[PDB]
């Protein structure tokens, strides 16, 4: 009886993902994920980014665990790690913009936008799986 | 008899721009611009970027003075200055990619791609105007 991820979480490449059914502001989304020992999703591979971008298209704009709330124009994941050069290609054309006003990052369409953190959007949690 | 820019060069915001009629590889484009005391275009304002992106759409993919030939994934203008955070929004979705293989930057459509430097593309030169 191999259970890769908890009930209603999805396994992808050694991690477990939870796709919210409701919409919350960015900070509340962060908190929701911490409630289940997880983090508002931190993207770390292209296959992961591809899967979360597709899934998120079916619901609508969706938060990820990325923001420049600490220092404008510097984007940090919720675990404090820096956004790598190779991931900057995921930004949509024209993003990030409205710097200092739109401080949190969302999947929008086929890439990332920065958006106003107070907006309510879907969100995704990620934590490690338990292998079999 | 006020002449803002030399013959067949276009004035925009204190600078003079030359739009090639032929296509050259990136290095040859750099050299062409140096022949006329100019530089393969270094973008320094949004109004400038807007104007060069529109004009370049009418001809086809066009080189700008930007490349990561010195150090992969670090993009420097031809005068050695670094690419600012605010200009990274000009990259098309999915760019820059093919890192280390596509080392020079072009206007493509409505944003920037990195491309193989050996390809022949149009190009644009920029130098200071002489005020009146
Ligand atoms: Ca935005
Ligand atoms: Ca490319």
Curated annotation (Swiss-Prot), chains A, B:
Q: Where does Ca(2+) bind?
A: 95, 97, 99, 102, 113-114
Q: Does the keyword Glycoprotein apply?
A: yes
Annotated glycosylation sites: 113
Molecular function GO terms recorded: (1->3)-beta-D-glucan binding; D-mannose binding; metal ion binding; polysaccharide binding
Q: Quick one: a GO cellular component term?
A: membrane
Q: What subcellular compartments does it reside in?
A: Membrane
Biological process according to GO: detection of bacterium; detection of yeast; endocytosis; phagocytosis, recognition; positive regulation of phagocytosis; positive regulation of tumor necrosis factor production
> Which Cys-Cys disulphide bridges does the record give?
5-16, 33-125, 104-117
What is the annotated tissue distribution of the protein whose record heads this document? Expressed in skin, spleen and lung, probably in a subset of dendritic cells. Detected in spleen extrafollicular paracortical areas including the red pulp and marginal zones, and at lower levels, in the follicular area. Detected in skin suprabasal areas adjacent to the epidermis and in epidermal cell layer.
What keyword terms does UniProt attach to this protein? Calcium, Disulfide bond, Endocytosis, Glycoprotein, Lectin, Mannose-binding, Membrane, Metal-binding, Receptor, Signal-anchor, Transmembrane, Transmembrane helix
Which segments constitute the C-type lectin domain?
11-126
Tree of life domain: Eukaryota
The free-text function statement in the UniProt record for this protein reads:
Probable pathogen-recognition receptor. May mediate the endocytosis of pathogens which are subsequently degraded in lysosomal compartments. May recognize in a calcium-dependent manner high mannose N-linked oligosaccharides in a variety of pathogen antigens. Is a receptor for ICAM3, probably by binding to mannose-like carbohydrates.
Something else known = In vitro, is a receptor for HIV-1, HIV-2 and SIV, but does not transmit virus to permissive T-cells under the conditions tested.
- Name of the protein: CD209 antigen-like protein B
Organism whose genome encodes this protein = Mus musculus
What high-level taxonomic lineage is stated for the organism? Eukaryota, Metazoa, Chordata, Craniata, Vertebrata
Source gene? Answer: Cd209b
């Amino acid at each position: 009886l191999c259970r890769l991820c908890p009930w209603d979480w999805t396994f992808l490449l050694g991690n477990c993902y939870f796709f919210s059914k409701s919409q919350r502001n960015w900070n509340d989304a962060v908190t929701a994920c911490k409630e289940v020992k997880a983090q508002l999703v931190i993207i770390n591979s292209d296959e992961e980014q591809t899967f979360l971008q597709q899934t998120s298209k079916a619901k609508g704009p969706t938060w990820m665990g990325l923001s420049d709330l600490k220092k404008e124009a510097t984007w940090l994941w919720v675990d404090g790690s820096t956004l790598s050069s190779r991931f900057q290609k995921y930004w949509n054309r024209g993003e990030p913009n409205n710097i200092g006003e739109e401080d949190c990052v969302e999947f929008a369409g086929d890439g990332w936008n920065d958006s106003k953190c107070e907006l309510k959007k879907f969100w995704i949690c990620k934590k490690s799986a338990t292998p079999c």
